[PDB]
Amino acid sequence: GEYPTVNEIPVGEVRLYQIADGVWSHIATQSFDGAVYPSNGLIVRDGDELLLIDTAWGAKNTAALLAEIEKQIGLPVTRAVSTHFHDDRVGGVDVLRAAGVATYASPSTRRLAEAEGNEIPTHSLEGLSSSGDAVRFGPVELFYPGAAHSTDNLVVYVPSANVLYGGCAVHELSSTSAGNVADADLAEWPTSVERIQKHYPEAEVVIPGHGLPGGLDLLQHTANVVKAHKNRSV
Ligand SMILES: O=C(O)/C(S)=C/c1c(Cl)ccc(Cl)c1Cl
Ligand SMILES: [Zn+2]
Numbered sequence: 001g002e003y004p005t006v007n008e009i010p011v012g013e014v015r016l017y018q019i020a021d022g023v024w025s026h027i028a029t030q031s032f033d034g035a036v037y038p039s040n041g042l043i044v045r046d047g048d049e050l051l052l053i054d055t056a057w058g059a060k061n062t063a064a065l066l067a068e069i070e071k072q073i074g075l076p077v078t079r080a081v082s083t084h085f086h087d088d089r090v091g092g093v094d095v096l097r098a099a100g101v102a103t104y105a106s107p108s109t110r111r112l113a114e115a116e117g118n119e120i121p122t123h124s125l126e127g128l129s130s131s132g133d134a135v136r137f138g139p140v141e142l143f144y145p146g147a148a149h150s151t152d153n154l155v156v157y158v159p160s161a162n163v164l165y166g167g168c169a170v171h172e173l174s175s176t177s178a179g180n181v182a183d184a185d186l187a188e189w190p191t192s193v194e195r196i197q198k199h200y201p202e203a204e205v206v207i208p209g210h211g212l213p214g215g216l217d218l219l220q221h222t223a224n225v226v227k228a229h230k231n232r233s234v
């Protein structure tokens, strides 16, 4: 009865975990380049509707996510935001868009998704192109901390619950490296994390893109891991 881990979730199944009143994470697993990884997203209650943050990493997982939401929560998902362009965030957007969900991402994320051959959210989120930018979107704040895991990565804050969803710019405490840095800005990532720390000092829960949620220490840990990664790589 703890947060589910990668070995507890078959590929194709999705679990929900209650984080706060009206805030849940969704957890799925997927195979990528030969290994299996867990991945998180967020669900936030918006009246009698739900806001989804990130897909469940693929069409089949995302269909399973919608079914699990309908079963466990029973409110309609009306909008979704993808927090960067990789398949763990946008894979499944076509399933959402067919199910009548309005899908959103920054123009940067949409253009990078198109270039990569990934699914593309329908609507552009303006006002997030400069580091430190923040905009309101239903029950959350979207924040662009600067380049980190990717140049387009957004974080999401739920002010009613002081929940910070860091997406893939934030690592779990057990992480020992920056992971796949193909699209990363390793020089900027620690500064981007500092911007998050300064902007959301009252966060009570921090949810990484992959792995276990914790407190504010996930932010400092991430900066530490990324600096060490860069040092080892240099
Ligand atoms: O480290 C992470 O959080 C992710 S999203 C790595 C990644 C990369 Cl860099 C490209 C493609 C894909 Cl599918 C993944 Cl999972
Ligand atoms: Zn990514």
Ligand SMILES: [Zn+2]
Pocket: 086, 088, 168, 209, 210
């Ligand atoms: Zn990721």
